[PDB]
Design an enzyme around this catalytic site. Structure first.
Site, PDB file in Angstrom:
ATOM      1  N   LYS A  36      -8.026  -2.921   1.477  1.00 46.12           N
ATOM      2  CA  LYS A  36      -7.963  -2.068   2.667  1.00 46.12           C
ATOM      3  C   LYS A  36      -8.781  -0.791   2.511  1.00 46.12           C
ATOM      4  CE  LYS A  36      -5.488  -4.448   5.646  1.00 46.12           C
ATOM      5  NZ  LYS A  36      -4.643  -5.392   4.877  1.00 46.12           N
ATOM      6  N   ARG A  58       2.872 -12.417  -1.667  1.00 45.65           N
ATOM      7  CA  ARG A  58       1.544 -12.780  -1.178  1.00 45.65           C
ATOM      8  C   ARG A  58       0.897 -13.825  -2.060  1.00 45.65           C
ATOM      9  NH1 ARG A  58      -0.761 -10.165   3.779  1.00 45.65           N
ATOM     10  NH2 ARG A  58       0.727  -8.427   4.052  1.00 45.65           N
ATOM     11  N   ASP A  85      -8.578 -11.493   8.429  1.00 46.26           N
ATOM     12  CA  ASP A  85      -8.077 -10.095   8.469  1.00 46.26           C
ATOM     13  C   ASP A  85      -9.024  -8.989   8.911  1.00 46.26           C
ATOM     14  OD1 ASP A  85      -5.612  -8.457   7.885  1.00 46.26           O
ATOM     15  OD2 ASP A  85      -6.858  -7.597   6.301  1.00 46.26           O
ATOM     16  N   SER A 126       0.869  -5.818  10.720  1.00 43.08           N
ATOM     17  CA  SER A 126       1.269  -6.667   9.602  1.00 43.08           C
ATOM     18  C   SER A 126       2.437  -7.583   9.971  1.00 43.08           C
ATOM     19  CB  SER A 126       1.625  -5.806   8.396  1.00 43.08           C
ATOM     20  OG  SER A 126       1.930  -6.609   7.279  1.00 43.08           O
ATOM     21  N   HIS A 131      -9.422  -5.125  12.991  1.00 45.04           N
ATOM     22  CA  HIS A 131      -8.328  -5.666  12.211  1.00 45.04           C
ATOM     23  C   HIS A 131      -7.825  -6.934  12.886  1.00 45.04           C
ATOM     24  CE1 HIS A 131      -4.154  -5.131  10.166  1.00 45.04           C
ATOM     25  NE2 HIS A 131      -4.972  -5.838   9.405  1.00 45.04           N
ATOM     26  N   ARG A 141       0.815  -1.219   0.000  1.00 46.66           N
ATOM     27  CA  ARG A 141       0.000   0.000   0.000  1.00 46.66           C
ATOM     28  C   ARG A 141       0.849   1.271   0.000  1.00 46.66           C
ATOM     29  NH1 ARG A 141      -1.521   0.671   4.397  1.00 46.66           N
ATOM     30  NH2 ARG A 141      -0.696  -1.203   5.432  1.00 46.66           N
ATOM     31  N   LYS A 145      -1.576 -13.035  12.200  1.00 48.01           N
ATOM     32  CA  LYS A 145      -3.045 -13.207  12.161  1.00 48.01           C
ATOM     33  C   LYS A 145      -3.482 -14.310  11.185  1.00 48.01           C
ATOM     34  CE  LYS A 145      -3.928  -8.923  11.022  1.00 48.01           C
ATOM     35  NZ  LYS A 145      -2.490  -8.448  11.029  1.00 48.01           N
ATOM     36  N   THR A 146      -2.959 -14.268   9.961  1.00 41.87           N
ATOM     37  CA  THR A 146      -3.320 -15.254   8.944  1.00 41.87           C
ATOM     38  C   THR A 146      -2.691 -16.611   9.230  1.00 41.87           C
ATOM     39  OG1 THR A 146      -3.726 -13.545   7.283  1.00 41.87           O
ATOM     40  CG2 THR A 146      -3.216 -15.758   6.436  1.00 41.87           C
TER      41      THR A 146
HETATM   42  N1  LIG Z   1       6.025 -17.794  15.727  1.00 43.30           N
HETATM   43  C1  LIG Z   1       5.417 -17.283  14.626  1.00 43.30           C
HETATM   44  N2  LIG Z   1       4.090 -17.023  14.584  1.00 43.30           N
HETATM   45  C2  LIG Z   1       3.475 -16.513  13.485  1.00 43.30           C
HETATM   46  N3  LIG Z   1       4.128 -16.219  12.334  1.00 43.30           N
HETATM   47  C3  LIG Z   1       5.471 -16.453  12.262  1.00 43.30           C
HETATM   48  C4  LIG Z   1       6.198 -16.994  13.417  1.00 43.30           C
HETATM   49  N4  LIG Z   1       7.496 -17.115  13.077  1.00 43.30           N
HETATM   50  C5  LIG Z   1       7.593 -16.678  11.791  1.00 43.30           C
HETATM   51  N5  LIG Z   1       6.394 -16.289  11.322  1.00 43.30           N
HETATM   52  C6  LIG Z   1       6.148 -15.721   9.976  1.00 43.30           C
HETATM   53  O1  LIG Z   1       5.593 -14.406  10.132  1.00 43.30           O
HETATM   54  C7  LIG Z   1       4.664 -14.132   9.095  1.00 43.30           C
HETATM   55  C8  LIG Z   1       3.280 -13.918   9.708  1.00 43.30           C
HETATM   56  O2  LIG Z   1       2.531 -13.427   8.609  1.00 43.30           O
HETATM   57  P1  LIG Z   1       0.929 -13.376   8.529  1.00 43.30           P
HETATM   58  O3  LIG Z   1       0.562 -13.407   7.066  1.00 43.30           O
HETATM   59  O4  LIG Z   1       0.332 -14.351   9.490  1.00 43.30           O
HETATM   60  O5  LIG Z   1       0.788 -11.889   9.124  1.00 43.30           O
HETATM   61  P2  LIG Z   1      -0.590 -11.075   9.256  1.00 43.30           P
HETATM   62  O6  LIG Z   1      -0.709 -10.743  10.730  1.00 43.30           O
HETATM   63  O7  LIG Z   1      -1.686 -11.890   8.628  1.00 43.30           O
HETATM   64  O8  LIG Z   1      -0.221  -9.748   8.404  1.00 43.30           O
HETATM   65  P3  LIG Z   1      -1.201  -8.814   7.472  1.00 43.30           P
HETATM   66  O9  LIG Z   1      -1.869  -7.924   8.478  1.00 43.30           O
HETATM   67  O10 LIG Z   1      -0.195  -8.069   6.623  1.00 43.30           O
HETATM   68  O11 LIG Z   1      -2.113  -9.749   6.719  1.00 43.30           O
HETATM   69  C9  LIG Z   1       4.719 -15.349   8.174  1.00 43.30           C
HETATM   70  O12 LIG Z   1       5.738 -15.107   7.177  1.00 43.30           O
HETATM   71  C10 LIG Z   1       5.140 -16.464   9.115  1.00 43.30           C
HETATM   72  O13 LIG Z   1       5.751 -17.571   8.449  1.00 43.30           O
HETATM   73 CL   LIG Z   2      -1.146  -3.018   9.794  1.00 42.22          CL
HETATM   74 MG   LIG Z   3      -2.893 -11.572   7.044  1.00 42.20          MG
END
Ligand SMILES: Nc1ncnc2c1ncn2[C@@H]1O[C@H](COP(=O)(O)OP(=O)(O)OP(=O)(O)O)[C@@H](O)[C@H]1O
Ligand SMILES: [Cl-]
Ligand SMILES: [Mg+2]
Length: 535
Positions: free
Chosen positions: A208, A328, A264, A245, A227, A60, A249-250
């Site tokens: 978003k 992604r 999300d 980010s 969020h 973004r 979460k995902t």
């Molecule tokens: N202990 C952990 N727990 C969660 N994720 C981890 C951990 N260690 C490494 N990672 C890595 O961190 C990243 C977490 O990314 P994820 O897509 O879950 O973030 P998000 O919170 O969904 O972000 P966004 O808000 O941008 O969607 C991944 O690349 C994952 O492999």
């Molecule tokens: Cl964010």
């Molecule tokens: Mg995510």
């Protein structure tokens, strides 16, 4: 469907070829057309998913985000210039809006257009009926994946109440004279109920963008807009996972032991928690099939990979961040086997988890929060990054983003806090802080350990554990948990001594205290300082 005259009503002229509600099969063939040039081009991977590049923008562009300030938005929007805290809600004139609308509508005139009708919000009573218009097939695919796909009956009665016009291929030559940030723009008008995009092809602006609109409309009707990811156990017990980010979460909501609600964007109304979206948008950097089997398995035909490196033979190098660290994949939610269906919603959340990736290596892997700490940490919205990695240095760099999503907040942070607290109190919800980031090892806590920690939160093991208080942050932490490495639970254990942990803890505490000072101009805010870290 819609007629060239219907598009003409929006200001888009001389459209000869209209693709309404493109099927997944059509989008696949469109992306792979061997005659495509530039950033429209897709390539087929060995996993069966098409991969595209999103162009110069691979994330973004908050500095190019603008909201028209008029009689509808003046007194409710959280404006960037109003002296109520830093945000990206920069005011735009109605006149400048008309200029931007002219740019986009002319760009889309005389082109073959994709028109995708979709919903934002699982519930008919509060959902937006959004009509997306683009000239790039993979952009149409992104929205088909990420928003809720209407049934044939819903399509027959479709009446848009928001229009998203993606003019990625155009730019704004008058930006300097208009006082804008660049020739690019991501603009919103709540009077015309429209989003305009120019210059950036990145699909996340649409995702978003609509989230930002839900974040405006829903809390003004008493509905939390969050969020977070969300999932539910077999007994109907719902959890929500907030975080900035990259915090997990995902990754962590996609759990074989839970039914996925969404990854999300969720609302919380009188009936419970509901997903705004129809798909998930996973990070693929260093993706491990062993560590994240369900997300990996979702990468197949109809998923859409972004900015990954595809080898000559069609295999993907998931480790290559040369284009961006923000690689992604999007996929419709049903690419995950264990989901809530046919509607992505469930009851009231009883577990609220705040994820953070602490690059300072201070915070415990898990702690149970008090009511006041929950409010303090929600407003704080902390995460950090090792910013110096490419230069061989740590450079832990903090981000404090209110409500774990300030970039998307259309109202003041306190409005989101108030309604979340109301919903949590009614539900008897309990809150937890989880560090998915670093400890004294200078390495990130393992996904294995974190999943075990989440299991322990959800099944009540943590609630029943013997706990003690970690100094400075005053966080209740367990002595042991099933399936978790005991050593990691006390963040002091991964340093040479507790004194070396404390040096880092004092640095981080000062950052929190300085950040929170801006919320102390009200009595309620001033009263939360006591719940924050104390030197
Ligand atoms: N202990 C952990 N727990 C969660 N994720 C981890 C951990 N260690 C490494 N990672 C890595 O961190 C990243 C977490 O990314 P994820 O897509 O879950 O973030 P998000 O919170 O969904 O972000 P966004 O808000 O941008 O969607 C991944 O690349 C994952 O492999
Ligand atoms: Cl964010
Ligand atoms: Mg995510």
């Amino acid at each position: 469907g819609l007629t060239p005259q219907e598009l003409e009503a929006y200001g888009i002229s001389d459209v000869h070829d209209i693709v309404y509600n493109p099927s997944y099969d059509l989008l696949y063939q469109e992306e792979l057309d061997p005659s495509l040039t530039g950033y429209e081009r897709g390539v087929l991977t060995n996993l069966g998913a098409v991969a595209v590049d999103t162009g110069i923008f691979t994330g973004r562009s908050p500095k190019d985000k603008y909201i028209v300030r008029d009689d509808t938005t003046r007194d409710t929007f959280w404006w960037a210039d109003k002296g109520k805290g830093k945000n990206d809600n920069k005011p735009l004139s109605p006149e400048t809006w008309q200029h931007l609308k002219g740019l986009v509508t002319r760009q889309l005139s005389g082109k073959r257009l994709f028109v995708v009708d979709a919903f934002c919000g699982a519930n008919p009573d509060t959902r937006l009926s959004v009509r997306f218009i683009t000239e790039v097939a993979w952009q149409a695919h992104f929205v088909k994946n990420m928003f809720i796909r209407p049934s044939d009956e819903e399509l027959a009665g479709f009446k848009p109440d928001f229009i998203v016009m993606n003019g990625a291929k155009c730019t704004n030559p008058q930006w300097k004279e208009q006082g804008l940030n660049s020739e690019n723009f991501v603009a919103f008008n709540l009077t015309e109920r429209m989003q305009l995009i120019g210059g950036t092809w990145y699909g996340g602006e649409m995702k978003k963008g609509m989230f930002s609109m839900m974040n405006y409309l829903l809390p003004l009707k008493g509905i939390a807009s969050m969020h977070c990811s969300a999932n539910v156990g077999e007994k109907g017990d719902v959890a929500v996972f907030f975080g900035l980010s990259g915090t997990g979460k995902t990754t962590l909501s996609t759990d074989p032991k839970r039914r996925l609600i969404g990854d999300d964007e969720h609302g919380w109304d009188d009936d419970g928690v509901f997903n705004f979206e129809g798909g998930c948008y996973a990070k693929t950097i260093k993706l491990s099939k062993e560590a994240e089997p369900e997300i990996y398995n979702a990468i197949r035909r109809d998923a859409l990979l972004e900015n990954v490196t595809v080898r000559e033979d069609g295999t993907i190098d998931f480790d290559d961040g040369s284009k961006t660290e923000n690689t992604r994949v999007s996929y419709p939610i049903y690419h995950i086997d264990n989901i809530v269906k046919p509607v992505s919603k469930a009851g009231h959340a009883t577990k609220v988890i705040f994820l953070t990736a602490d690059a300072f290596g201070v915070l415990p892997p898990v702690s149970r929060l008090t009511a006041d700490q929950t409010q303090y940490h929600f407003l704080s919205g902390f995460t950090a990054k090792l910013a110096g990695t490419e230069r061989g240095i740590t450079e832990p760099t903090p981000t404090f983003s209110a409500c774990f999503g300030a970039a998307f907040l259309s109202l003041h942070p306190t409005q989101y806090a108030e309604v979340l607290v109301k919903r949590m109190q009614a539900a008897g919800a309990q809150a937890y802080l989880v560090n998915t980031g670093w400890n004294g090892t200078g390495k990130r806590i393992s996904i294995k350990d974190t999943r075990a920690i989440i299991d322990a939160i959800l099944n009540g093991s943590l609630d029943n554990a013997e706990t003690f208080t970690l100094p400075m942050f005053n966080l209740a932490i367990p002595t042991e948990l099933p399936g978790v490495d005991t050593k990691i639970l006390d963040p002091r254990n991964t340093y040479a001594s507790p004194e070396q942990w404390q040096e880092k803890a004092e640095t981080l505490a000062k950052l929190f205290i300085d950040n929170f000072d801006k919320y102390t101009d009200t009595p309620a805010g001033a009263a939360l300082v006591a719940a924050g870290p104390k030197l």
